[PDB]
Amino acid sequence: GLFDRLGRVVRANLNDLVSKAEDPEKVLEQAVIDMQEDLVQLRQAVARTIAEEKR
């Protein structure tokens, strides 16, 4: 549709406008912080399912 095509244009400009706000030096270490605490959340949920196989 025409308004799909306009939507994908205006949406892509906004996504590029964000992408050049990303400083490689700051974001590259935050990405590793986020990925580490994701594992802390995951390990809690897994263990909570192990408790029930035991049970």
Binding site: R43, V46, A47, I50, A51, R55
Partner: protein
């Protein structure tokens, strides 16, 4: 009594699973190897003396 027994078995399993899963992971698992400290060469060089 029977209702209170199940509460105990829920606590026991919750503790054991969290402890078992933390028993995985490379550092904790390598720490169980005897020669894991990494001075066996200079130890051997000392034993040679």
């Amino acid at each position: 009594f029977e209702r209170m027994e199940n509460k105990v078995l829920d606590m026991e399993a919750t503790s054991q699973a969290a402890g078992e899963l933390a028993g995985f992971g490379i550092e904790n698992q390598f720490a169980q190897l005897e020669a894991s400290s990494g001075v066996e060469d200079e130890l051997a060089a000392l034993k040679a003396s």
